Design a protein around this ligand. Structure first.
Ligand code: SF4
Ligand code: SF4
Ligand code: F3S
Ligand code: F3S
Ligand code: FES
Ligand code: FES
Ligand SMILES: [Fe+3]
Ligand SMILES: [Fe+3]
Ligand code: NI
Ligand code: NI
Lengths: 634, 634
């Protein structure tokens, strides 16, 4: 019954192949884990010192308290805070990598990289207060890179990738509650300190710390998007395809997987240089395809087709046609290294801090990026030769995907309706009800949830109710693989008001047709683009973000990064749905803070709801409450 | 049977009182936790994403692997690395607090603080390369504080509080393995990143990262000692007392508990100013007593008597005579806040990131330290008045404690035997066998181990075999409470060779008697002082630390900080005993790295041994192996 595992037909087909070949998958490893520990599920477990492990029974008799005296409240809040810090750290590593790449590029130390988007460079400099008039671009960029690195530590200003990206009224609310981060890595360390044994032991205090660390995560996301746009170009609308059918038996199929475009962008360019070398090996060329966020990055900037996402990543290998999987860090199931020996795929790690036993490691240095890419791609070509004559099973399943909707691109599209007030047509249509509100789908797939089922079920209900839907990360991946990024599906999916707006925008952009049903805003760091759009709307309207009819949904969340993103969505003022249970239910006081009393602090709040049709109703209620608060019909 | 819980008679007496009063203790909460989870005990549990909790059976059938494919090796190494990062973070917060205090002091923003040890200031400046000739002390100190803060982040130098405190040959070995930290908070964040889902998944790679983060912990320890010595004075030999009998029914009894002398040092000075105000309230005065590291800090610098330590901290309250417990952060059982309502004690938190529900919070700002201290101490005086006429039960049990053996003080003591080559008399007596080697006892008490039993059992065996024993933290606390810091016990405890050396040193220092059986080197950050001594010996001999007959023992370890300290002891080259099981036994490959193959990387290694007489034999074998490698009899 493969539809219980994934709603993606291509994934189902590969699940059948894996089963008859005896190749264990993530779903099999989940089945082998059941029943999962109920202490961990509820958050009522602590291993923060060597007197543990400690646990607390959700109900009944002892144990009721940790050995040191830590209550359920404390234990739950500490575990949650550590997850937020871990998510922030992954974003810290990604953004910091980009900042070092930009610095090296403009210092002449990494000639494969350059300032591709000078307009974005200057507009970031202006946002930060860095002077541009009379300055060389390379010096402006050096100052931007230095400012990015400075936000990792304490200094005489707070984290500018928070305070310069949200409207002053939001910054004021956050400052009044002590929530503005002092430095990105500073906050990560402070979380790890305060949550260590015998430190912070007040749930509200712990959770305020977590909100602040989530803003350090936001800063890392925003910095990552900013720097990748400078280096690799700001996305604009592009047309491509998704799902396993984008693999080609007669090509060298190379997946880029992980997160940082410092790696994947060069793989894309260098692969085009090597087309004749691939052809000498009997291939048609090198077919680069994307998995997870780094796939999203190259999809957004270059139209590289997306192979698959998140929980189903192993299935690309099961086709037998995946010659190489080129990795950097984050969200890579380490099972890929063992599956590769069964499928023939060459799995290649590239980052010193992210190795997998059994995978080939090829260090990738920005200073030698082109040469390191050629070494990697020659391993892929060799692998293609080894499967000469071997049958492959690529499901002939793909969707059309229109993407590339950076905030700059959205504003440009709207400007065709109103050149000097581009946000006004969007606002006008919220007011007249053609657009009920906005929902951002974000985050991962999670083996506990049939793959994509929550994203598609919720998105369908919202689209029929005229909600403008935007998406990032593997939420965008779920939606694209089910046709939600194909404008041919607007009539089927969209309410009449939303269809009218998507059509009016599309026709004014010369498309002869509408924008797609869902706007793909990019990778998970590119949730920052949604922040830029929402902050721009708030500024245009003269209200704070917690008055806008905008919600978020991490409908199938998995990674610590998704916990961090959901927490900063709450902190900036949004009603934020999570469609899997975070480890909080073991403390009613913590649950009540996160789902209710945080409204009084930031105006946002979590909506924890595992049933997707119920979650859609709750999301619509949250949007409609925001509409009523603005005096609008709903 | 209270001797099964603690070997300290005073603690036993208070356990009996707590039992008849119905006051739950840490031992009761431990009993209620049994049997503890065997997945957590072995390290075979992961909660690093929302697909978890995952576990692996140590033996038998499925589950054998985490849902994402993470092996036992990976899961164990990731959990260990996060513990190291958490320990480093606690040390980051402590050192950073001191650096900000020093900066404020010399900028005129915190007049309660000053440069007390100008010699230490100048010798730190010289060690770091900061010019002193022709400079004002306040400017030198500003540069030292700036250098301390700079070591938290990446810059054009590595962490100087690693590279300037170990000999070049050690730094070279560590650099060859990529182990020198780039920045303290940078490494903490990198650990949290690499251990997040879908990142590093190679045990050896993960553990190398952990070794590097442990050096970030060492830098925080060393920075903490350096800055506290500048601000509050370098310790020199002092005589005081320990155990609950240091409480006085007729005084206002105030415990300082937690970690940072920025708080406790001012409590000590201000309490003396308030003696007439305490007397107006009917007390004899304010009797400041120490718990845990901040108690050690004021013991070492001012001879403030130590009340108790670590696992037995609640027992101070059970006397009924503890009027106030003044907290900052780390190692404070949060049970103290509920026990206070039973005992009448006023528990006061002071740090924004370390609150306890039910405790009174009085913010403590360096800028207002004296005034904030008076507010705190007036709460203590009010509490004393409330117990007028109430019987108290203070066990009449105390030991004499000689302490204050900073490395500077040890060198000075030795200089009375050899003025211009002070380390030579120590080396001479190692060579002639009067001193077999050196053992550092460090770390906590742990409820799993009858309190102090491992420290005292191991120390007795080593002292009889002529080992020079030094101690810090609650290891020093255990030893002092059992008489190991009283020179009157030298004849009973020490082998003839060690007694001869302690006597020769003591007589040359005018004592008419020996140094104490164990030298108290201070708080847990002051494990850095032992590093300074051992590095000085290595430099004097022209060999690396992994050739010296020096070992460490975290005999009853508890906190993540103790895991970090033990890991850096290994990383700098020492055989390092741990007397409780860290969560590693679920992976034989990880255990083998930590106990054996790390020898080939750093020359140090863990000795995991829960039986203390066996651990003593293993420690002596390690010392004697080092002696043999130097060509010495043993
Ligand atoms: S910190 Fe407290 S609750 Fe956590 S493992 Fe240690 S004793 Fe148990
Ligand atoms: S990171 Fe892997 S092993 Fe850990 S909880 Fe998630 S799926 Fe399980
Ligand atoms: S890249 Fe990773 S953070 Fe979630 S959105 Fe996709 S599994
Ligand atoms: S102060 Fe804490 S780190 Fe251990 S040595 Fe004492 S319980
Ligand atoms: S008792 Fe299962 S997660 Fe700890
Ligand atoms: S299963 Fe008990 S510590 Fe997780
Ligand atoms: Fe991602
Ligand atoms: Fe301590
Ligand atoms: Ni994501
Ligand atoms: Ni300690």
């Amino acid at each position: 019954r493969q539809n219980l595992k994934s709603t993606d037909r291509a994934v189902q087909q590969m699940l059948d192949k894996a089963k008859r070949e005896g190749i264990q998958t993530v779903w099999d490893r989940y089945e082998a884990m059941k029943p999962q520990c109920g202490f961990g599920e509820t958050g009522l477990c602590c291993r923060h010192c060597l007197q543990g492990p400690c646990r607390i029974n959700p109900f009944g008799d002892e144990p009721k308290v940790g050995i040191c005296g830590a209550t359920a409240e404390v234990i739950v809040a500490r575990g949650l805070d550590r997850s937020i810090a871990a998510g922030a750290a992954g974003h810290s590593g990604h953004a910091k990598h980009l900042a070092h790449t930009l610095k090296k590029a403009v210092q002449g130390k990494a000639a494969s990289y350059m300032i591709k988007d000078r307009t974005k460079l200057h507009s970031i400099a202006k946002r930060l207060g860095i002077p541009t008039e009379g300055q060389k671009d390379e010096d402006i960029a050096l100052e931007v890179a230095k400012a990015a690195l400075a936000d990792f530590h304490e200094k005489d200003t707070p984290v500018l990738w928070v305070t310069t990206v949200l409207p002053p009224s939001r910054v004021k609310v956050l400052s009044a509650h002590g929530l503005i981060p002092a430095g990105i890595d500073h906050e990560i360390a402070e979380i790890m300190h305060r949550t260590s044994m015998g430190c912070d032991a007040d749930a509200q205090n712990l959770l305020l710390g977590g909100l602040r660390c989530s803003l350090a995560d936001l800063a890392g996301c925003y910095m990552g998007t900013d720097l990748a746009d400078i280096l690799f170009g700001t996305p604009a609308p592009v047309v491509t395809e998704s799902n396993l059918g984008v693999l080609k038996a007669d090509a060298v199929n190379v997946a880029v997987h992980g997160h940082n475009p410092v790696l994947s962008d060069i793989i894309v360019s260098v692969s085009k240089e090597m087309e004749n070398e691939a052809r000498a090996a009997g291939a048609t060329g090198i077919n680069v395809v994307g998995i997870c966020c780094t796939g999203n990055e190259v999809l957004m900037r270059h139209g590289i087709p997306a192979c698959t996402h998140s929980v189903s990543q192993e299935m690309a290998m099961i086709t037998g046609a995946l010659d190489a999987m080129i990795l950097d860090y984050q969200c890579i199931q380490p099972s890929v290294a063992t599956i590769a020996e069964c499928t023939g795929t060459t799995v290649i790690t590239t980052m010193e801090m992210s190795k997998i036993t059994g995978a080939t490691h090829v260090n990738f240095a920005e200073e030698a990026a082109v040469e390191n890419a050629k070494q990697i791609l020659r391993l892929a070509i060799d692998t293609f030769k080894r499967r000469k004559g071997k049958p492959v099973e690529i499901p002939n399943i793909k969707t059309k995907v229109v993407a590339g909707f950076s905030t700059e691109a959205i504003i440009n599209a709207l400007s065709k309706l109103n050149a000097n007030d581009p946000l006004k047509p969007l606002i006008d249509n919220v007011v007249n009800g053609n657009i009920r509100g906005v929902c951002l789908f974000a985050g991962c797939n999670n083996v506990k949830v049939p793959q994509d089922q929550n994203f598609t079920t919720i998105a369908r209900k919202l689209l029929k109710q005229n909600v403008l839907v935007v998406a990032t990360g593997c939420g965008a991946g779920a939606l694209m693989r089910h046709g939600f990024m194909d404008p041919a599906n607007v009539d089927e999916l969209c309410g009449d008001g939303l269809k009218a707006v998507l059509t009016a925008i599309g026709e004014a952009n010369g498309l002869g047709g509408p924008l797609p049903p869902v706007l793909h805003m990019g990778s998970c760091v590119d949730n920052s683009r949604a922040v830029a759009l929402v902050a721009a709307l708030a500024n245009r309207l003269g209200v704070d973000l917690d008055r806008l009819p905008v919600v978020a949904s991490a409908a199938e969340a998995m990674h610590e990064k998704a916990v961090a993103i959901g927490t900063w969505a709450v902190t900036i003022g949004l009603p934020t749905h999570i469609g899997v249970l975070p480890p909080i239910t073991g403390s009613l006081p913590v649950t009540q803070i996160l789902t209710s009393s945080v409204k009084d602090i930031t105006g946002g709040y979590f909506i924890v709801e595992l049933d997707p049709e119920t979650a859609a109703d709750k999301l619509l209620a949250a949007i409609n409450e925001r509409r009523a608060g603005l005096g609008l019909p709903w």
